Amino acid sequence: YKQCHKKGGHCFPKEKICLPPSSDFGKMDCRWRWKCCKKGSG
Amino acid sequence: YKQCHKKGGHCFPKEKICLPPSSDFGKMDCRWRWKCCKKGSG
Amino acid sequence: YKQCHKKGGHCFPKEKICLPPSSDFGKMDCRWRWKCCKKGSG
């Protein structure tokens, strides 16, 4: 997903914890029932 | 909050795990950095 | 989680700023890498 990758992120299931919450970018262009979190997050 | 409550949810921090994920209704009208999950969630 | 909620808090990720530190109740029975902060610091 181009836009998630552009933000430095990857797609994960929407309930996956991404820390800090600022690195969780929301759905972006990930699929339905996934969200985009910045690499480094957890 | 009206809309979250109307869905039968409550507000929780943005990264709180809410399972099943269909019980997570996203931000709704919770505060910034919070999200609405159906009562009984995660 | 039960003890956190009992103490009037919510569980937030470990690096969430909770001030004043007296309203940061440490882990309580929040999940690994989360902590309990009193209503008002979040």
Swiss-Prot record, chains A, B, C:
Which cysteines are cross-linked by disulfides?
A: 4-36, 11-30, 18-37
Motif window: Nuclear localization signal: 2-18, 27-39
Q: Where in the cell is it found?
A: Secreted
Biological process GO annotation list? defense response to bacterium; defense response to fungus; envenomation resulting in occlusion of the pore of voltage-gated potassium channel in another organism; killing of cells of another organism
Positions bearing the site annotation: Involved in the interaction surface toward Kv? 1-2, 33-34
Bilayer-crossing regions: none
Q: Which GO terms describe its cellular component?
A: extracellular region
Describe, from its UniProt entry, the tissues in which this protein is expressed: Expressed by the venom gland.
Q: Does the keyword Disulfide bond apply?
A: yes
Gene Ontology molecular function: potassium channel regulator activity; toxin activity
Keyword entries, A-Z: Antibiotic, Antimicrobial, Disulfide bond, Fungicide, Ion channel impairing toxin, Myotoxin, Neurotoxin, Pharmaceutical, Potassium channel impairing toxin, Secreted, Signal, Toxin, Voltage-gated potassium channel impairing toxin
Q: What does this protein do?
A: Cationic peptide that possesses multiple functions. It acts as a cell-penetrating peptide (CPP), and as a potent voltage-gated potassium channel inhibitor. It exhibits antimicrobial activities, hind limb paralysis, and severe muscle necrosis by a non-enzymatic mechanism. As a cell-penetrating peptide, crotamine has high specificity for actively proliferating cells, and interacts inside the cell with subcellular and subnuclear structures, like vesicular compartments, chromosomes and centrioles. It penetrates into the cells as fast as five minutes after its addition to cell culture medium.
More info: Negative results: has no hemolytic activity. Has low harmful effects on normal mammal cells. Does not show activity against the filamentous fungi A.fumigatus and T.rubrum at concentrations up to 125 ug/mL. Does not directly affect voltage-gated sodium channels Nav1.1/SCN1A, Nav1.2/SCN2A, Nav1.3/SCN3A, Nav1.4/SCN4A, Nav1.5/SCN5A and Nav1.6/SCN8A.
Describe the subunit structure.
Monomer.
Q: Which family does it belong to?
A: Belongs to the crotamine-myotoxin family.
**UniProt-recorded name of the protein:** Crotamine
